[PDB]
From Swiss-Prot, chain C:
Subunit structure: Homooctamer formed by 4 homodimers. Interacts with ARR4.
Tissue specificity as recorded in UniProt: Expressed in roots, cotyledons, rosette leaves, cauline leaves, stems, flowers and siliques.
Gene behind this protein: DEGP9
Active site (record annotation): H45 (charge relay system), D76 (charge relay system), S121 (charge relay system)
Domain of life per record: Eukaryota
A single BP term in Gene Ontology: proteolysis
Intracellular or extracellular location(s): Nucleus
Protein name (record): Protease Do-like 9
Parent sequence residues shown: 125 to 588 of 592
Region of interest: Serine protease: 17-142
Length: 465, 465, 412
């Protein structure tokens, strides 16, 4: 106990097809775990209800499935917040109550449901370490608890209790470990508290802020001396700054970040966390709210400066997810133009896309920064075969970089240049020094019959209409 | 302890051959578990003594096997009630005593004997859920306990104890789970009490009543409005009524059942069961005794009606079992006529008969209702090859629907029409628009020599003589 | 050998489970060969759902866009052409190769069949596929095209029959000892012969060929074959003389032969699948491609028994009768409580029998009643408020990226 607050989550999903962005896949149902908390609220994983079209909740002792409402989705922290109108669902359950951030080697008990099973499952372990990690690959890294108990579909989203019967967070199945390694994570209470308090204040999820920099350790003493650091000072060198984090352009490459909100940062980027414990300084940042300001102290040209910087969320050139929105696409003459995101790469190349995708794309995934707030990697995804595009059918996942001499910044820009093209020819500059040339008049005329052939409702996603 | 009341059941079985209904299979012995209770009584599974010709009981500390008496067999609840004349068997054992219906996640300890072993085995688990389930496939669904401990031959029939040393029911091996899933059932004490009290009152088993209806949920609000339901009312729509449950013909299709014996029924067919627990409304029905009456409240034509309905057992067109009776058959000219039951289908098509039997038969198994109290599905089972039936040898498991223009209602009817046939020809209308024609005089004369060839004692089962 | 061409095929095939969509393009390579009359021969399965077939001659650098002339589904043969005259100026190809190959056992022997058991499919004997497609099938296929100017398939006698091997059965129906044949069990209502033939007729002969008690006719010395072989040799629209015993008398009918109309069609000749949607209820018609797409290759065991019964045993009672099901329910507030309805037959709409998909779609459009009441199989009903159910449809289509509430054939 209290087992009666631990519910099963039935979710009907309607996933976009990122490879065929005019399609939604067949409806399917998934089950996971979740739990009732104070104030007529239920907590589960964000991944358990992504692309939801209906959510239902089932208590362990009753056949009845209750229609639920999704209140907010925190994708970066993998939390969803639900409610239920039916008062019968709430009646007679004592809500889960939250405990303090656990100590290492503290006992933890994870309560949930097996895969495809409707009976309670109970899994035991210890907190093996504190960690900063992504809950969505390629997305912002947050505080987490690592536990020596494996988590699998089913129990992820159930509560994790300390020996005092208090919940210390939401179970989370590891993305980077095989199920037999018996390692799992718990989304901890300060992350949970960040997400609920964020919703309670803004009536919406507003994300987790980042500073918008990459950094390099300062552990070599000649490096420190050569940039004016006094022998008591320590910190990290700024390698690069996101062009699209404008509040951070007050910072500059090769600044030495000395402290953040007063907390002293070491040469390896760690800050003190608790007795005998050190953690990366990003936990100081991600515990703030988007829009919060932070005191950053740097060494610049052997002199100390202090900046108050408004913090924002990270904008990735190739986004880790697109918030459940439909992927954007545009078609002309059977050429399918779309943008590159992580779900696109996963759907095109499978689980190992970080090794099987084209190196041109991997470069941009691993290393490129967006140069503008609206920049997108635009590609020819595929060519829908037809007479108008004879000779081009082999083109797959190749960046479009220019149209009739003008650079392509994003998909909407390219859709605009194709619509307003008055030249005799449409000349696309592709990657690998390729060009695609189409007669403007005959290519626009060819589009409709291709749409029909492939049952494409429209030549573009609504966001471009 | 108290291990000394947990006995081994040795049973000699003489099973009918449903594929060759003139034969009894070779005697064989099976062992299972059972336990002594108050009043010179032993409890075991019904399946452990089906087709019994002798039962013996062995206590764990003594070589001696005691000749037992079968008092009653409750097939639907899988319980057999035995006694023993020898007073030495009873002397010095403290009888098992029964506890209350357990709560979810309560500890349960199952005591029995391994397969082919005569030493005590002890298995531990928790009650994982309350359930309504069939203990014989295709037979009436009853209250049961699901436990996270697997049960296998051997221990099924042993007692299940709560931590207070009280028995909360009889172990039961799952029909729908592989042994490695570690899931089993316990026939609970209110079912046990139903069966003993039933015997103690009628000097015989009288079964578990059903209402005789199929129903459809009422969870859609337009469905509810369109049939006059006020916003506070809830219940289920009657889809169909068994023709042979005449006390229920007072009900009518599209009645909305609102409550049963006062208990309010929800739109999903659940009723409250305990604190925070809901179960299907059939538990209200099957806890009554055959012959009991029940108050049923329906909405009919937007108006409330209340009926007092005498409850009876379910009569299935294709019966789930035939109570250990011998299967009926009738032979003429080497044509073997028999009726279709579940044991017949199992013996003809194996464990997967619900996928391997002819679709014509599966339809009737899954969906047909008996149209009369004595209706039977009659089939040609096989043709015993002989000159008189040349050209017909391939006919297998095909329904007989008419004889000389008259419909076949059951096997006895067909046996009567063949005996009193005065026409020159016997013309059987079979399924798939086939006919079998035989010269009446020569076919009746051919029968005896076929019986002899196949060592068939008689042309019919005794029930047709 | 310079008349053996390479055949690149790009396929776009429908989703029978989601009939508003087309699966992703995929490509096949095959062979083919040129014959007389500006005509190219290949396999059917190698150009099924072709969106573009181009052809490439031996040793040539040019791929010519083809036009497929006829696809013979029942017999796995197709036939293409190319409008450019340069293509017609004056054994097959390995996968991924543009060079001719010439190859197991050949010999080694051992709608209705041709019955011969045991890079690159398409080439030139007859048409290989990967056995060799024989020439007695090709010629029927070609001569069918060369006559109808399209493919019409192979005719059938729309009857089921039972052997007449048992003496007493024969005597009871008046068959003299020398007479042999098969007894009609049932006749397809949508066959022309359902007029003139009757149940329990004994079919004795077909175009003067005597039919045995077990349904076979002579074939070669020492070998017989089922009489359906005779009927499949004819062409659609041909006449045939069918001689029967009825009430102990001999009658001979001249019957114009026709294509089989199956209630659950074995395929739909590459036409798109049809669907109709209202308030998230997806209605469609049961075909074998549907059952296969819904339930896998074991569909004859995993599909619901109600549908399996129709598939194995039902005859269409009308020429346009279809088996209409609720395929699935696209969940939305309008259809709350109905979401578990899957592949269940619709039998009536507001009291009136449903005969086919277009019929059902018409009744919904013209429904002026307050409620829409669908009688489903398993004695179920679906009730929706007519005004709000029609109003809810559009957003459900939007959510699922469905272009309209129905397939084009239902706009008709």
């Amino acid at each position: 106990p209290s087992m009666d607050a631990v519910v099963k989550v039935f979710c009907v999903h309607t996933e976009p097809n990122f490879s065929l962005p005019w399609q939604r896949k067949r409806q399917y149902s998934s089950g996971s775990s979740g739990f009732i908390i104070g104030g007529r609220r239920v907590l589960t994983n964000a991944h358990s209800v992504e692309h939801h079209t209906q959510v239902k909740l089932k208590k362990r002792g009753s056949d009845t499935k209750y229609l639920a409402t999704v209140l907010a989705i925190g994708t970066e922290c993998d939390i969803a917040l639900l409610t239920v109108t039916d008062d019968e669902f709430w009646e007679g359950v004592s809500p889960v109550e939250f405990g303090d951030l656990p100590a290492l080697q503290d006992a933890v008990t994870v309560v949930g449901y097996p895969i495809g099973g409707d009976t309670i499952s109970v899994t035991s372990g210890v907190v093996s370490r504190m960690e900063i990690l992504s809950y969505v690959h390629g997305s912002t890294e947050l505080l987490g608890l690592q536990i020596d108990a494996a988590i699998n579909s089913g129990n992820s989203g159930g509560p994790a209790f300390n020996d005092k019967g208090k919940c210390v967070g939401i179970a989370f199945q590891s993305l980077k470990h095989e199920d037999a390694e018996n390692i799992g994570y718990v989304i901890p209470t300060p992350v949970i508290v960040h997400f609920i308090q964020d919703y309670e204040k803004h009536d919406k999820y507003t994300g987790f802020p980042v500073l918008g920099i990459e950094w390099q350790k300062m552990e070599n003493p000649d490096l420190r001396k050569s940039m004016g650091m006094e022998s008591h000072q320590k910190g990290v060198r700024i390698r690069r700054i996101e062009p699209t984090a404008p509040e951070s352009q007050v910072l500059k490459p090769s600044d030495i970040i000395l402290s953040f909100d007063g907390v002293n940062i070491a040469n390896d980027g760690t800050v003190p966390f608790r007795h005998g414990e050190r953690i990366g300084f990003s936990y100081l940042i991600s515990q703030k709210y988007t829009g919060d300001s932070a005191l950053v102290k740097v060494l610049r040209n052997k002199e100390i400066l202090e900046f108050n910087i408004k913090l924002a969320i990270h904008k990735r050139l190739i986004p880790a997810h697109i918030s459940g929105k439909p992927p954007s696409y545009f078609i002309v003459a059977g050429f399918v133009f779309t943008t590159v995101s992580v779900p696109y790469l996963r759907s095109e190349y499978g689980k190992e896309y970080e090794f099987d995708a084209p190196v041109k794309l991997l470069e941009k995934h691993l290393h490129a920064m967006a140069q503008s707030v609206d920049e997108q990697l635009v590609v020819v995804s595929q060519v829908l075969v037809s007479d108008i595009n004879i000779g081009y059918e082999e083109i797959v996942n190749t960046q479009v970089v220019a149209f009739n001499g003008k650079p392509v910044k994003n998909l909407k820009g390219l859709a605009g240049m194709v619509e307003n093209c008055e030249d005799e020819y449409m000349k696309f500059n592709l990657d690998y020094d390729q060009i695609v040339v189409l007669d403007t008049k005959t290519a626009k005329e060819a589009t409709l019959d291709i749409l029909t052939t492939h049952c494409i409702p429209s030549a573009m996603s609504d966001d471009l209409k």
